């Protein structure tokens, strides 16, 4: 069918643009943020993949939870997640964000940020190296490549 071919090509084009231009929110919680900085530094240079930090949630596509999420902080993380225009993605980075980690049995720690927001990629480590975070980012790009919103819409 011609229509199916057209929606497939438009799907690929949109998927390509989104993966290519991923803007994470300038947002860091704890130790893991330091490795995030090392991903932006010369050695790795995330900017060369089209990945640039932007402070505003309105101009951001990706949230990287890089650090422990405490109970006091969870409403603010949820709020800045909700202020991201869609499509939006969340990368959970480090043991603390993934499941609580070293502070899993604390009265003031959220046992995993996926209780608060939906997570796309879980990056293990304490902290994950800058290379491991880069691997997770490229995995998120690969996942975005697989999405077929237009094909799904056409089939409806």
């Amino acid at each position: 069918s011609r229509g199916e071919y057209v929606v497939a090509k438009l799907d690929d084009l949109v998927n390509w643009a989104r993966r290519s231009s991923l803007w994470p929110m300038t947002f860091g919680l704890a130790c893991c943020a330091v490795e995030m900085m090392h991903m932006a530094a010369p050695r790795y240079d995330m900017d060369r993949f089209g990945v640039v930090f932007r402070a505003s949630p309105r101009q951001s596509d990706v949230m990287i939870v890089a650090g422990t999420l405490t109970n006091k902080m969870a409403p603010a993380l949820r709020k800045v997640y909700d202020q991201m225009p869609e499509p939006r993605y969340v990368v959970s980075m480090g043991s603390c964000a993934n499941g609580g980690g070293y502070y899993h049995y604390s009265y003031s720690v959220v046992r995993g940020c996926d209780r608060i927001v939906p997570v796309d990629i879980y990056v293990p480590g304490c902290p994950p190296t800058a290379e491991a975070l880069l691997y997770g980012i490229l995995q998120l790009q690969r996942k975005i490549k697989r999405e077929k919103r237009l094909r799904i819409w056409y089939r409806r």
Partner: protein, 96 residues
């Protein structure tokens, strides 16, 4: 001089097996450097070195276009390296 740098560029495009191989490596790895083939993989990955590059750029892999079942012409990742070449590539040892 500048002309010798241009000649280096032309021997770099000549050194990748022609213009189409040059374009393949440029669009597959965003790099067109020429190095000594250290070895090959049982899965098709090729491993090169160039000790005149600074530490970090002196060893690299051109990944296979066809891993176990999936097409990897564009979709490559660091997890495709087998453990022995993983040890060599991350400079844990000097011996391939």
């Amino acid at each position: 001089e500048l002309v010798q740098v241009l000649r280096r560029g032309l021997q770099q495009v000549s050194g990748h097996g022609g213009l189409r191989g040059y374009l393949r490596v440029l669009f597959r790895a965003n790099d067109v450097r020429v190095g000594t083939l250290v070895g090959e993989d049982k899965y098709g990955n090729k491993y090169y070195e160039d000790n005149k590059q600074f530490f970090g750029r002196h060893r690299w892999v051109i990944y296979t276009t066809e891993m176990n079942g999936r097409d990897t012409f564009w979709d490559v990742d660091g997890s495709m390296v087998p453990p022995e070449w993983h040890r060599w590539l991350h400079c844990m040892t000097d011996d391939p």
